[PDB]
Amino acid sequence: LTSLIEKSPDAKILRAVVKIVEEWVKNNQTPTLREKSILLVKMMTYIEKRFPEDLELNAQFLDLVNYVYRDETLSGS
Amino acid sequence: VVPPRSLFDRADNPEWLISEDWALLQAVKQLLELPLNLTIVSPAHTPNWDLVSDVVNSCSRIYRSSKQCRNRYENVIIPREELRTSQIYAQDENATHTQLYTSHFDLMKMTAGKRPKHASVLAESGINYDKPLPPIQVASLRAERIAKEKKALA
């Protein structure tokens, strides 16, 4: 997933990865906080830099970040 | 003053003179308001070594880069403060910097201390140098020459 976020050129793949990560975050059946953090940091670094023009992908990622900051469990983490 | 909580809070080729080290330490302490170990007190007040380099270079004997200032602070002043730089500055009594300027003045003083045939061409032209023509006659000659040139052209 990290290599898809970093190197994969297809924006549909990035949208699918962001959907997978959003479903994981909004839910042992889910990844640990460290894996979510790694994926979110990679997305934060590469999605905006590699796809500035994709407004829908950036909107989806920013909606996920917004949910994370609104969430009480992850607040202060 | 306590800063409000945010959503992101986790709940050298020339030798350095004592005046340069003192300026470096005082810049870091007074301006950045950082502690000895540069631990961040307020998230917005991140260390700015460009400002410190500007402060040091106001009295330095040579241009000190921001990287050089950071390296000097971390590698000398932190271990020295952990005689202190203030004590060395007070004991020097500006002697070293005065002797530096004396040496520069001596080098500048050393540098400061280390610091006929003319008638032939007239006769070829036809000019009697010893019998000046008044400007009226020379103007008349010019007019005659111009008239002859115009006649030749026509």
Curated annotation (Swiss-Prot), chain A:
Family membership noted in the UniProt record: Belongs to the PI3/PI4-kinase family. TRA1 subfamily.
**Part of the whole protein covered:** 2351 to 2433 of 3859
Q: What does this protein do, in the record's words? A: Adapter protein, which is found in various multiprotein chromatin complexes with histone acetyltransferase activity (HAT), which gives a specific tag for epigenetic transcription activation. Component of the NuA4 histone acetyltransferase complex which is responsible for acetylation of nucleosomal histones H4 and H2A. Plays a central role in MYC transcription activation, and also participates in cell transformation by MYC. Required for p53/TP53-, E2F1- and E2F4-mediated transcription activation.
| Protein name as annotated | Transformation/transcription domain-associated protein
Q: What is known of its domains?
A: The PI3K/PI4K domain is required for the recruitment of HAT complexes, and the MYC-dependent transactivation. Although it is strongly related to the PI3/PI4-kinase family, it lacks the typical motifs that constitute the catalytic site of PI3/PI4-kinase proteins, and lacks such activity.
Which subcellular locations apply to this protein?
Nucleus
Subunit and partners: Interacts with MYC, E2F1 and E2F4 transcription factors. Interacts directly with p53/TP53. Interacts with GCN5L2. Component of various HAT complexes. Component of the PCAF complex, at least composed of TADA2L/ADA2, SUPT3H, TADA3L/ADA3, TAF5L/PAF65-beta, TAF6L/PAF65-alpha, TAF10/TAFII30, TAF12/TAFII20, TAF9/TAFII31 and TRRAP. Component of the TFTC-HAT complex, at least composed of TAF5L, TAF6L, TADA3L, SUPT3H/SPT3, TAF2/TAFII150, TAF4/TAFII135, TAF5/TAFII100, GCN5L2/GCN5, TAF10 and TRRAP.
Q: State which disorder the record connects to this protein.
A: Developmental delay with or without dysmorphic facies and autism: An autosomal dominant neurodevelopmental disorder apparent from infancy or early childhood. Some patients present with intellectual disability and renal, cardiac, genitourinary systems, as well as structural brain abnormalities. In some cases, the phenotype is less severe, has no systemic involvement and is characterized by autism spectrum disorder and/or intellectual disability, sometimes associated with epilepsy. Affected individuals manifest variable dysmorphic features.
Swiss-Prot record, chain B:
Domain of life, per the record? Answer: Eukaryota
Q: Which family does it belong to?
A: Belongs to the SNF2/RAD54 helicase family. SWR1 subfamily.
What's the protein name? E1A-binding protein p400
Q: Which organism is it from?
A: Homo sapiens (Human)
Q: Where in the cell is it found?
A: Nucleus
Q: Which gene encodes it?
A: EP400
Q: How does it assemble?
A: Component of the NuA4 histone acetyltransferase complex which contains the catalytic subunit KAT5/TIP60 and the subunits EP400, TRRAP/PAF400, BRD8/SMAP, EPC1, DMAP1/DNMAP1, RUVBL1/TIP49, RUVBL2, ING3, actin, ACTL6A/BAF53A, MORF4L1/MRG15, MORF4L2/MRGX, MRGBP, YEATS4/GAS41, VPS72/YL1 and MEAF6. May also participate in the formation of NuA4 related complexes which lack the KAT5/TIP60 catalytic subunit, but which include the SWI/SNF related protein SRCAP. The NuA4 complex interacts with MYC and the adenovirus E1A protein. EP400 interacts with TRRAP, RUVBL1 and RUVBL2.
Expression by tissue, per the entry, reads:
Ubiquitously expressed.
Q: Which residues of the complete protein does this chain represent? A: 2311 to 2530 of 3159
What this protein is reported to do is described as: Component of the NuA4 histone acetyltransferase complex which is involved in transcriptional activation of select genes principally by acetylation of nucleosomal histones H4 and H2A. This modification may both alter nucleosome - DNA interactions and promote interaction of the modified histones with other proteins which positively regulate transcription. May be required for transcriptional activation of E2F1 and MYC target genes during cellular proliferation.
Q: What residue stretches are annotated with the Myb-like domain?
A: 12-77
